[PDB]
Ligand SMILES: [Cu+2]
Ligand SMILES: [Cu+2]
Ligand SMILES: [Cu+2]
Ligand SMILES: [Cu+2]
């Protein structure tokens with residue numbers, strides 16, 4: 001099974017996917033985030049952040065509240081299972097995490113914590 | 129508030145969204161389903177079907193079993209709150225339903241009953 | 257004095273207060289519960305339930321055992337002094353009760369009976 | 385004789401069967417429980433629990449009262465002859481037990497201890 005996915009965020013505050021599957025045979029999984037937009041990180045930043053569905057709102061709220069210099073993530077936020085850095089136009093960033101950190105049955109969500117994010121700038125992550 | 133949404137189904141057996149919001153002040157709500165793919169209805173049919181989250185399994189199971197000639201919906205399925213017809217490439221169909229059929233605190237799902245739909249070929253419909 | 261308080265429950269199974277005061281000059285008192293989270297009632301429900309400290313465990317235990325269809329409250333539970341209904345993301349519910357139901361010297365607790373509730377998902381209610 | 389059975393729980397709080405037969409020549413018997421529903425364990429959990437018909441009431445009452453974190457079973461319940469873990473959508477669990485635990489002339493029941501179970505959410509297990 002493939003153990004990596006390629007995700008893009010654009011100038012419209014949109015990922016080009018709303019659902020990621022992670023095969024349970026993968027020991028590590030890698031998300032390759034890129035930004036094919038024109039706008040710089042300060043005005044149109046994207047990151048890819050993973051948490052349980054219950055923690056998502058808190059991660060996003062405290063993250064926006066932390067500011068750009070903190071990558072819009074609260075420091076030492078244990079709710080964050082994995083994340084990329086925040087990136088602007090023409091940048092890329094990959095995160096590899098251990099799939100064992102995921103549990104069968106639990107509900108996981110991926111999302112971006114740059115302020116202005118819509119209710120749909122998020123997605124499901126599911127084991128298969 | 130707006131009381132309609134445009135949904136597209138594609139040639140990879142997907143919807144372009146997995147989350148629809150229905151403003152609570154809407155008396156009626158309209159889903160505009162379109163099929164911009166190239167594949168005909170008998171190989172890549174899409175419908176948009178709404179039920180409670182708990183009823184989705186039964187609607188999907190009985191519907192897929194009812195055949196192309198019934199639009200893959202069990203006849204007289206009272207669990208189906210609203211639905212479009214099954215469409216192929218270049219077809220469109222709209223459904224309008226009364227928002228009083230939705231109840232606060234209840235969870236609702238939209239999905240597709242054409243055989244072969246993955247577990248991810250569905251979404252949440254939520255009152256806001 | 258004021259005879260109302262505004263309480264919020266989130267996606268972390270948390271209230272935003274652990275202590276409510278009720279002025280003895282209030283003839284009625286109103287709890288305004290809201291759910292600013294993103295998660296639906298079936299996975300992340302909240303209610304606000306009031307009982308003596310001694311009855312709380314039994315209310316909670318028999319409530320969880322009653323299931324979601326009964327709002328996680330045992331029917332005809334005479335230990336329940338006052339309660340809101342169970343609510344999910346985007347919902348609100350208010351309960352007004354007669355302050356005369358409270359007696360000086362007695363210890364009262366407020367809490368939530370949705371399962372998974374931690375031993376901190378409660379709070380004191382005190383006359384002043 | 386075959387010494388195993390496949391059992392499904394669904395999103396309507398039901399098993400697919402209400403009657404299991406265990407051939408008396410079986411030395412071990414295996415129950416393969418699965419959850420083809422869409423709803424998670426905290427909203428639509430299923431377990432398969434075996435006891436005498438007389439012990440069913442106590443196991444259910446004590447179990448449902450024991451909470452999601454104990455899989456809705458009283459700790460160290462000597463009445464439980466065999467059980468699967470509690471599973472949600474997409475999960476599966478198997479239990480194998482010694483048939484010498486069953487005695488001729490006794491009556492046995494299987495059931496589920498997830499709160500909200502109906503009186504029909506159960507079945508007979510019979511030596512044959
Ligand atoms: Cu592989
Ligand atoms: Cu973003
Ligand atoms: Cu309007
Ligand atoms: Cu479809």
Ligand SMILES: [Cu+2]
Nearest residue numbers: 257258259281
């Ligand atoms: Cu006053």
Ligand SMILES: [Cu+2]
Nearest residue numbers: 301302303368
């Ligand atoms: Cu609560």
Ligand SMILES: [Cu+2]
Nearest residue numbers: 385386387409
């Ligand atoms: Cu045999």
Ligand SMILES: [Cu+2]
Nearest residue numbers: 429430431496
């Ligand atoms: Cu069950």
